[PDB]
Curated annotation (Swiss-Prot), chain B:
GO terms for cellular component: cytoplasmic exosome (RNase complex); exosome (RNase complex); nuclear exosome (RNase complex); nucleolus; nucleus. The keyword S-adenosyl-L-methionine does not apply. This is Exosome complex component RRP45. Pfam families: RNase_PH (PF01138), RNase_PH_C (PF03725). SUPFAM superfamilies: Ribonuclease PH domain 2-like, Ribosomal protein S5 domain 2-like. The keyword Nucleus applies. GO terms for biological process: exonucleolytic trimming to generate mature 3'-end of 5.8S rRNA from tricistronic rRNA transcript (SSU-rRNA, 5.8S rRNA, LSU-rRNA); nuclear mRNA surveillance; nuclear polyadenylation-dependent rRNA catabolic process; RNA catabolic process; RNA processing; rRNA catabolic process; TRAMP-dependent tRNA surveillance pathway; U1 snRNA 3'-end processing. It comes from Saccharomyces cerevisiae (strain ATCC 204508 / S288c) (Baker's yeast). It is found in: Cytoplasm; Nucleus, Nucleolus. Component of the RNA exosome complex. Specifically part of the catalytically inactive RNA exosome core complex (Exo-9) which may associate with the catalytic subunits RRP6 and DIS3 in cytoplasmic- and nuclear-specific RNA exosome complex forms. Exo-9 is formed by a hexameric base ring of RNase PH domain-containing subunits and a cap ring consisting of CSL4, RRP4 and RRP40. Interacts with LRP1. GO terms for molecular function: mRNA 3'-UTR AU-rich region binding.
UniProtKB/Swiss-Prot annotation, chain C:
GO terms for molecular function: mRNA 3'-UTR AU-rich region binding. It comes from Saccharomyces cerevisiae (strain ATCC 204508 / S288c). One of its GO terms (cellular component) is nucleus. Pfam families: RNase_PH. The keyword rRNA processing applies. It is found in: Cytoplasm; Nucleus, Nucleolus. Present with 3180 molecules/cell in log phase SD medium. InterPro entries: ExoRNase_PH_dom1, Exosome_comp_Rrp42_subfam, PNPase/RNase_PH_dom_sf, Ribosomal_Su5_D2-typ_SF. Belongs to the RNase PH family. It comes from the Eukaryota. The modification Phosphoserine is found at S19. Component of the RNA exosome complex. Specifically part of the catalytically inactive RNA exosome core complex (Exo-9) which may associate with the catalytic subunits RRP6 and DIS3 in cytoplasmic- and nuclear-specific RNA exosome complex forms. Exo-9 is formed by a hexameric base ring of RNase PH domain-containing subunits and a cap ring consisting of CSL4, RRP4 and RRP40. Interacts with NIP7 and NOP8. Interacts strongly with RRP46. This is Exosome complex component RRP43.
UniProtKB/Swiss-Prot annotation, chain D:
It comes from the Eukaryota. The gene is MTR3. It is found in: Cytoplasm; Nucleus, Nucleolus. Component of the RNA exosome complex. Specifically part of the catalytically inactive RNA exosome core complex (Exo-9) may associate with the catalytic subunits RRP6 and DIS3 in cytoplasmic- and nuclear-specific RNA exosome complex forms. Exo-9 is formed by a hexameric base ring of RNase PH domain-containing subunits and a cap ring consisting of CSL4, RRP4 and RRP40. This is Exosome complex component MTR3. Present with 7380 molecules/cell in log phase SD medium. It comes from Saccharomyces cerevisiae (strain ATCC 204508 / S288c). One of its GO terms (molecular function) is RNA binding.
Curated annotation (Swiss-Prot), chain F:
The gene is RRP40. Component of the RNA exosome complex. Specifically part of the catalytically inactive RNA exosome core complex (Exo-9) which may associate with the catalytic subunits RRP6 and DIS3 in cytoplasmic- and nuclear-specific RNA exosome complex forms. Exo-9 is formed by a hexameric base ring of RNase PH domain-containing subunits and a cap ring consisting of CSL4, RRP4 and RRP40. Signal peptide: none annotated. The lineage of its organism: Eukaryota, Fungi, Dikarya, Ascomycota, Saccharomycotina. One of its GO terms (molecular function) is manganese ion binding. InterPro entries: Exosome_RNA_bind1/RRP40/RRP4, KH_dom_type_1, KH_dom_type_1_sf, NA-bd_OB-fold, RRP40_KH-I, Rrp40_N_euk, Rrp40_S1. Gene3D superfamilies: 2.40.50.100, K Homology domain, type 1 (3.30.1370.10), Nucleic acid-binding proteins (2.40.50.140). It is found in: Cytoplasm; Nucleus, Nucleolus. This is Exosome complex component RRP40. PANTHER family: EXOSOME COMPLEX COMPONENT RRP40, PNAS-3 RELATED.
Length: 222, 299, 339, 215, 223, 237
RNA sequence: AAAAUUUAAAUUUUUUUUUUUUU
């Protein structure tokens, strides 16, 4: 099982080795790119791990610590795709600020990172209003002084924020947060594009070199 | 796109009617004064009643007639609102209601009424006729548009002339403009519409089962006046005392005996203004011909 | 306080999605384009003509097809296909009134469903305008010389054609532009793809009946009557055709241009005012604001020029440079596909 | 008329003219549209009839409507240059299209996400001296290749085969049917209508997987 | 210089101007900044939507491009960062043609820019510079060049031209070109000559204009 | 014969001066330069002001731009909880007003105003780019309950520069002749709003028609007889 | 003769051009 077309039938649910006289059972575990599909053939049923995508087979395992063997099946592309890497709960997503409310802040999803950096930008055109947009509520900006929140003192339109997914929310937008000392503002130009490039003075403040002008943004830890 | 007015301001005018006052300075049953001025082109006119300003345009060209009435020429009126005349309006909403409330009137005021002989657009039957066009532009609103566009179109028809024609089968000879004169058009009757504007000072029930008629009706609602009115009514007549259209499409309930008593007062109003058009058409054409006298003696 | 503020840098595919503008400014530092080109590196142009007209096969022209002369255009990452039909109305030196044009309809399949987009609605107008301002087409080229189908002996038909000269008739032509994978400005490729379709248009042989059955009819008035004229329906031949007559010495070609001004901050080592042409690549189309678009026919001719100056100044010399770059890019394409 | 377009003067008219087991064949190509994320190109030519058409993917696009658990498909059939199929004739096929892919696509992988499918019936020869029914199975193939190009979770290379005015769509190497379409034909020819469809399906899916795995 | 203008002639609208050159009467209207729609906003700059009504007929494609080139010119005139998440609807009315709309669009494009420039002054919005446009033609038969032709001269014109310039420092420095609408047949050599009068003439136009603005508005101003 | 200006003129003053910016001038965020960007007449603040001068252009407008510490008149249009929806000018953007920004500030006490009322309030906090905010009661009131909701009255719209002269100027002849007939109230709104209540609607119409006419004619010296005539026009009766 | 007793009301945007109905 190496290279896969969508529909390439790969392996059953279970397999068997004999490692030194004692019998060891395999547990083929479906992952992304997979689906167990039952198959009757000449009478008898059969479940099988199915390639549902384009690229490479990859079989892995990890047990949770904090004679059978679980084997995660994992299917990949191999030698540009983001529907592969749709945002799930808790992820770190780079976004651009769309509009500032007194209530809240609104951004659009652009780029999703990954675990052990590795990214996945969306390949979409925002000028259609195509992309997924999300919402940061103003009390969710940080937890330190979470009540008397001054929204303008952390964000302006069009700016880049390393933010964490809260949850799905509705279908229209997202529940999103920045409430950490490592999260928040990544980069913007001065006066929302009307001036040059600005650098985070602290983790807590931001200036600009040539100008001599600073602004308050909830910057990320660099 | 929403006009916002305080309810305090709402009671204010409603009080002023209850003491027989209105903010403009007219009487209740008094109409604005009308300024009519023509451009150099035929079928070109600027019409102005105080704050409301309009402009329209008449033209014509060659087309075939329909199968429907193969005898007669073609004619239609455009009344596309631009949000220039007020920020309420969409960019050319032909599907808004008030637009239709502006539309169907002028549709009935002109087209179904037939002030203009469409049969006098027949150049040759079924082959080539006229396509006469009426583009209405609004400039700035203080209401009375549907009365203004009533006038300014009918103003424009009495100033447009069409050029000279000669027929030989297909050899249809449109002549040069300046050798052979342009020829004006045939108006069967001159219609003038009147906006009526209605104000209950009371609740519903004292209009409904309060037998006492107590409802104030005025002419030519100004902009602030127009935003609180309760019924909408327009009648149209002529010089020969026939009633062209009436449209009360709902709104406030309303006594019949009022409406006849209303429509009689329309008559004396519209007649004087009508003749004022009639002299100015002459007098401008007199000024055209006196300047034509100031041209041939000059040249 | 003198501070080594360490910035945060990214993969380049991250950057362009974020900053169209600064990622451009990265390319300008090396002096390149984010379409990986250097300043004046221009896209290849590839066509096939006449494939989708029925007049592709000169040997066997098929039956139910209705297409006059066709053009395929691919250049860069945008495929555009040009199709020509024509219609006929019953018709009854170098000045504009001698000059007509066609009726095109563009569609850009840019993912959006819905009505006619405003980018498209400009296009078919803008072409038609300078086609008139090209003065390509005297209406003598629209004059149709019909034959009459002589009902000859034993039930056979031959169309008597007159040659070398009562009603007249006129071709009226049409176009359709389909746009696939829009990556930038489209108008130059809208222009140039038409031009090769224009040279492939045959005029099909039109004829009327010998004596059409469809004759004069009368209509009764309320006492009077008139006569409908006889309805001679023109018919184009299934077979014969003639080509199209062109003021060939006015066939232009298209080219756009962009001039930018540069930040000192944006450099990476491996005033300052740069001309770019062959514009593409959204980041470019966002951020270029003083621009130049030119029509030109290869002997130094110019159908039009289009300046929108919204960014930089314009020198007299970037003008001449673009003019120098005009007569190259056009003249090659005149000679490239030799149609 | 239509104030939004250039349609010429009205009294003109277009030009008029009067009279004076076989092989199907493909040429399948992907990755050529940069607006999309999934593209597919199809040439077809068979015995009097040559056909070319384009299938275009936009996804996953955001949904401004509301929450859904999973994905949603949208399919457009548009006339190309010459052949003009009827408007209501189009969307019936678009209805028939969506039913099959709703036994294909892992929508559950794609919550609140849209699928846009643009099909361009671009150019067709019919030089032969239910005319839409002869073009059904090639659509599904053209969609599947573009949907592989956007790389979306698809259960099977499902395909349809044709036997004389009859369209039957398969999976599992034909061992199940996912989409059924019938016009006039014979009566109880179904059993032969199993076969010739199946083998074209047995042909076509092999042609498809060659187009991708060899690239 | 048979041009003439009016400022502040509408009522419910922020900026209004009648521009009257030699034959064409055109009024422009400006409303802004006002509440933008959902599909129309920009997070940073100012959104602009522009409507031109012809004198004759309705809004079609012929109107559409004259709109859209006029979109391009105003965008650097406006200090666009000053009004984020906002909208200024601007609307132009063609009232008089003064030119064959079937054959030309030249003078109107010169006219409407010269119209809309002044209603913004009525509107008093943060702007950047000063501007002007003129129509220029070159005769087919005489082969000479007239600034501000007529429509019969357009009939014998070979090539029609509109120049839009950006004027600063007392409106004297050509800061930039805005629009050069080269249409008709032309070469290299005519073009630098074609600028070279309009280099002067548009400044000569604005030289009139600078006066006119203050004459109309300083009595509207208070002392 | 003034310090008249255009956007795109030469700015008069030297660059090395400590200068508080007034409105109408714009500093470049990109190239740090500063230019007059509006139409009209500059008025240079004269010297001696701590060595710091100030430029401002007289420009004319009707469309009011919300700016801070400014007294405006507003309309209750929605009850977005904790925080009112209020408008200041038709077709413009709505403004947000706290429910608590009120002279008896009490968070358990929710006040009483309803949709469609007229209130007097000052712009407290307003970025150019953010949802603007106002206050009736302010800290800059200094515990003053001087703003507030209005009663019925009557409100008239004028252009802004006129309304400045209503506020900023005692030489403005209007309040003289009006006090010379009857006694009444006046609220001044920098949003071009002028709210008046009299003892009488009769005089209020007399108050109405003058202010429409005078601001139209905009000729302050002529306003003696023009005002008094409308009284006779009311005293026509 | 004292003593005291009770409440709580809802916030921030998705769509396809106008004929044409019997003197």
């Amino acid at each position: 099982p190496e290279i896969a077309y969508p529909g390439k039938l790969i392996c059953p649910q279970y397999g068997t080795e004999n490692k030194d006289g004692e019998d060891i059972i395999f547990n083929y575990v479906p992952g992304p790119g997979t689906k167990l599909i039952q198959y009757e053939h000449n009478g008898r049923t059969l479940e099988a791990i199915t390639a549902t995508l384009v690229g490479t087979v990859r079989c892995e395992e990890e047990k949770k610590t904090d004679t059978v063997k679980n084997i995660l099946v994992s299917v990949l592309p191999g030698t540009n795709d983001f529907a592969n890497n749709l945002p799930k709960e808790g992820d770190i997503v780079l976004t651009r600020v769309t509009r500032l409310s007194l209530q809240r802040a609104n951004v659009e999803i652009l780029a999703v990172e990954d675990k052990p950096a590795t990214f996945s930008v969306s390949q979409a055109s925002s000028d259609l209003g195509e992309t997924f947009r999300g919402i940061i509520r103003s009390q969710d900006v940080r937890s330190t002084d979470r009540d008397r929140v001054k929204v303008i003192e952390c964000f302006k339109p069009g700016d880049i924020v390393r933010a964490q997914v809260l949850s799905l929310g509705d279908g229209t937008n997202y529940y999103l947060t920045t409430a950490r000392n490592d999260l928040g503002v990544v980069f913007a130009r001065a006066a929302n594009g009307a001036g040059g490039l600005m650098y985070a003075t602290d983790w807590q403040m931001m200036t600009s070199p040539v100008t001599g002008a600073t602004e308050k943004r909830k910057c990320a830890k660099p | 796109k929403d006009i916002e007015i305080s309810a305090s301001e709402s009671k204010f005018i409603l009080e002023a009617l209850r003491q027989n006052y209105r903010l403009d300075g007219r009487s209740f049953d008094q109409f604005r004064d009308v300024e009519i001025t023509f451009g150099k082109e035929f079928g070109d006119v600027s019409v102005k009643m105080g704050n409301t300003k309009v402009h329209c345009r008449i033209s014509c060209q060659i087309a075939q007639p329909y199968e429907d009435r193969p005898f007669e020429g073609l004619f239609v009126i455009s009344t596309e609102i631009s949000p220039m005349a007020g920020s309420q309006f969409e960019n050319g909403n032909i599907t808004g209601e008030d637009e239709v409330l502006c539309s169907r009137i002028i549709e009935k005021s002109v087209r179904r009424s037939g002030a203009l002989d469409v049969e006098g657009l027949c150049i040759v039957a079924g082959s080539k006729c006229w396509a006469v066009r009426a583009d209405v532009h609004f400039l700035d609103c203080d209401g009375g548009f549907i009365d203004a566009s009533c006038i300014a179109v009918m103003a424009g028809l009495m100033h447009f002339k069409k050029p000279d024609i000669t027929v030989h089968g297909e050899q249809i000879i449109v002549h040069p403009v300046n050798e052979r004169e342009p020829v004006p058009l045939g108006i069967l009757h001159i219609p003038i519409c009147v906006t009526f504007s209605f104000f209950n000072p009371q609740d519903t029930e004292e209009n409904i089962k309060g037998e006492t008629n107590s409802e104030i009706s005025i002419i030519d609602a100004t902009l602030k006046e127009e935003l609180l009115r309760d019924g909408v009514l327009t009648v149209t007549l002529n010089k020969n005392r026939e009633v062209v259209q009436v449209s009360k499409a709902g709104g406030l309930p309303m006594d019949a005996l009022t409406l006849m008593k209303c429509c009689h007062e329309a008559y004396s109003i519209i007649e004087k203004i009508t003749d004022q058009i009639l002299q100015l058409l002459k007098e401008d054409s007199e000024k055209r011909n006196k300047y034509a006298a100031m041209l041939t003696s000059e040249n | 306080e003198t501070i080594e503020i360490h910035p945060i840098t990214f993969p380049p595919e991250v950057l362009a999605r974020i900053s169209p503008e600064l990622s451009l400014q990265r390319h300008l530092s090396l002096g390149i384009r984010p379409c990986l080109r250097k300043y004046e590196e221009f896209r290849d142009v590839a066509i096939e003509n006449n494939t989708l007209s029925r007049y592709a096969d000169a040997g066997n022209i098929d039956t139910k097809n209705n297409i006059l002369g066709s053009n395929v255009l691919k250049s860069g990452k945008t495929i555009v296909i040009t199709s020509i039909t024509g219609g006929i109305i019953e018709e009854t030196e170098d000045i504009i009134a001698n000059y007509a044009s066609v009726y095109p309809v563009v569609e850009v399949e840019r993912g959006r469903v819905g009505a006619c987009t405003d980018e498209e609605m400009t296009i078919s107008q803008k072409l038609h305008d300078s086609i008139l301002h090209s003065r390509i087409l005297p209406k003598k080229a629209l004059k149709v010389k019909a034959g009459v189908r002589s009902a000859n002996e034993d039930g056979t038909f031959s169309v008597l054609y007159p040659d070398e000269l009562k009603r007249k008739w006129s071709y009226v032509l049409y176009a359709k532009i389909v746009v696939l994978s829009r990556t930038g400005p489209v108008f130059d490729l809208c222009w140039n793809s038409l031009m090769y379709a224009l040279q492939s248009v045959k005029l099909p042989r039109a004829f009327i009946d010998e004596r059409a059955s469809d004759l004069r009819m009368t209509i009764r008035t309320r006492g009077r009557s008139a006569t409908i004229r006889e309805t001679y329906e023109i018919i184009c031949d299934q077979t014969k055709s003639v080509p199209l007559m062109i003021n060939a010495k006015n066939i232009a070609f298209a080219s756009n241009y962009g001039i930018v001004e540069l930040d000192p901050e944006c450099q990476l080592q491996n005033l300052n005012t740069v001309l770019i042409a062959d514009l593409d690549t959204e980041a470019e189309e966002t951020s270029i604001h003083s621009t130049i678009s030119i029509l030109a026919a290869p002997s130094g001719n110019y159908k039009q020029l289009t300046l929108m100056g919204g960014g930089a100044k314009i020198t007299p010399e970037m003008i001449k440079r673009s003019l120098l770059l005009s007569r190259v890019r056009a003249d090659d394409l005149s000679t490239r596909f030799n149609i | 008329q239509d104030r939004r377009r250039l349609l010429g003067p009205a009294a003109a008219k277009p030009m008029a003219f009067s009279n004076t087991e076989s092989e199907q064949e493909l040429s399948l190509h992907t990755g050529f549209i940069e607006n999309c994320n999934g593209s597919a190109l199809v040439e077809a030519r068979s015995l009097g009839h040559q056909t070319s058409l384009i299938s275009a993917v936009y996804g996953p696009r955001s949904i401004r409507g509301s929450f859904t658990s999973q994905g949603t498909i949208s399919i457009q059939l548009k006339n190309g240059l010459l052949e003009k199929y009827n408007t209501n004739e189009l969307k019936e096929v678009s209805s028939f299209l969506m039913g099959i892919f709703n036994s294909v696509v892992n929508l559950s992988r794609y919550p609140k996400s849209g699928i846009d499918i643009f099909v361009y019936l671009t150019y067709d020869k019919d030089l032969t001296n239910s005319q839409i029914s002869s073009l059904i199975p090639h659509c599904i193939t053209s969609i599947t290749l573009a949907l592989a190009d956007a790389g979306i979770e698809l259960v099977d290379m499902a395909g349809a085969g044709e036997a004389n005015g009859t369209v039957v769509s398969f999976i599992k190497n034909g061992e199940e049917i996912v989409g059924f379409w019938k016009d006039d034909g014979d009566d109880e020819d179904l059993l032969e209508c199993l076969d010739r469809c199946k083998e074209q399906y047995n042909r076509y899916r092999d042609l498809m997987i060659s187009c991708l795995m060899n690239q | 210089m048979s041009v003439q203008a009016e400022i502040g002639i509408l009522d419910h609208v922020d900026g209004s101007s009648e521009f009257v050159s030699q034959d064409t009467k055109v009024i422009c209207s400006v409303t802004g900044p006002i509440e933008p729609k959902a599909r129309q906003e920009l997070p940073t700059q100012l959104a602009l939507e522009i409507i031109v009504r012809p004198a004759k007929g309705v809004a079609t494609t012929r109107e559409k491009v004259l709109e859209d080139k006029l979109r391009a010119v105003l965008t650097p005139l406006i200090t666009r960062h000053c009004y984020p998440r906002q909208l200024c609807q601007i609307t132009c009315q063609i009232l008089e043609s003064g030119e064959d709309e079937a054959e030309f669009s030249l003078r109107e494009l010169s006219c409407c820019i010269n119209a809309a420039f002044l209603a913004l002054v009525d509107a008093g919005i943060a702007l950047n510079s000063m501007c002007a446009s003129i129509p220029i033609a070159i005769i087919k038969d005489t082969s000479d060049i007239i600034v501000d032709p007529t429509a019969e001269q357009l009939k014998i014109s070979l090539s029609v031209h509109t120049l839009a310039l950006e004027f600063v420092n007392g409106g004297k420095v050509v800061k930039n070109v805005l629009l050069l609408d080269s249409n008709g047949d032309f070469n290299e050599d005519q073009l630098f000559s074609l600028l070279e009068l309009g280099e002067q003439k548009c400044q000569e136009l604005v030289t009139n204009i600078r006066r006119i603005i203050q004459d109309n508005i300083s009595p509207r101003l208070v002392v | 014969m003034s310090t008249f200006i255009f956007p795109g003129d030469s700015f008069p003053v030297d660059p090395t001066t400590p200068v508080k910016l007034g409105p109408g001038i714009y500093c470049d965020p990109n190239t740090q330069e500063i230019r007059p960007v509006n139409t009209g007449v500059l008025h240079v603040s004269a010297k001696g002001k701590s060595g710091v001068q100030t430029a401002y252009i007289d420009y004319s407008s009707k469309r009011y731009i919300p700016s801070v510490n400014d007294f405006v008149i507003g309309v209750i249009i929605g009850t977005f909880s904790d925080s009112y929806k209020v408008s200041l000018q038709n077709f413009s953007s709505s403004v947000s007003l706290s429910y608590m920004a009120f002279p008896n500030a009490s968070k358990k006490n929710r006040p009483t105003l309803q949709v469609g009322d007229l209130v007097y309030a000052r712009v407290c906090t307003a970025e150019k780019e953010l949802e603007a905010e106002i206050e009736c009661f302010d800290s800059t009131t200094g515990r003053d309950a001087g703003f507030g909701i209005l009663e019925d009255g009557m409100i008239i719209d004028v252009n802004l520069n006129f309304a400045r002269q209503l506020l900023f100027n005692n030489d403005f002849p209007l309040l003289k002749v009006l006090a010379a007939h009857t006694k009444f109230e006046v609220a001044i709104g920098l949003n071009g709003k002028i709210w008046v209540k009299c003892e009488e609607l009769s005089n209020t119409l007399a108050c109405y028609r003058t202010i429409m006419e005078c601001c139209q004619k905009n000729d302050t010296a002529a306003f003696k007889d023009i005002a008094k005539r409308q009284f006779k026009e009311i005293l026509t009766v």
